[PDB]
């Protein structure tokens, strides 16, 4: 719907509405606590954290 | 002012909608 | 009250910049 995208969250499976610039993209479980952060291939505040 | 007052609304409306705008052409740059 | 007359001129360059903004996104979200 534009500015704005519905998502299911893991740990409740609850429907959330959210703002699609609040969404940050998720790394493959490929790169599970890489040693070197540059290695991500998605770099961002939440796959750093 | 009326005149004024609508104006300056419309302006910071226009600001908003920019500061809005500037999130999503950031994120689109990162990506 | 004067002051209409710059804040017309600031409209007028917030809205050129979130013209040129909104080209910037269809243009990145392209590429």
Redesign the interface.
């Known amino acids: 719907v534009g500015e704005e995208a519905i998502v299911e969250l893991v740990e409740n499976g609850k429907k959330v509405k959210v703002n699609?610039?609040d969404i940050q993209?998720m790394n493959p479980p490929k790169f599970s606590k890489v040693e070197d952060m540059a290695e991500l291939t998605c770099?961002?505040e939440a796959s750093v954290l | 002012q009326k005149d004024l007052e609508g104006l300056s609304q419309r302006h910071e409306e226009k600001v908003a909608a920019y500061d809005k705008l500037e999130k999503t052409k950031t994120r689109l740059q990162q990506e």
Do not use: H, V
């Open positions: 699609k610039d993209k770099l961002n």
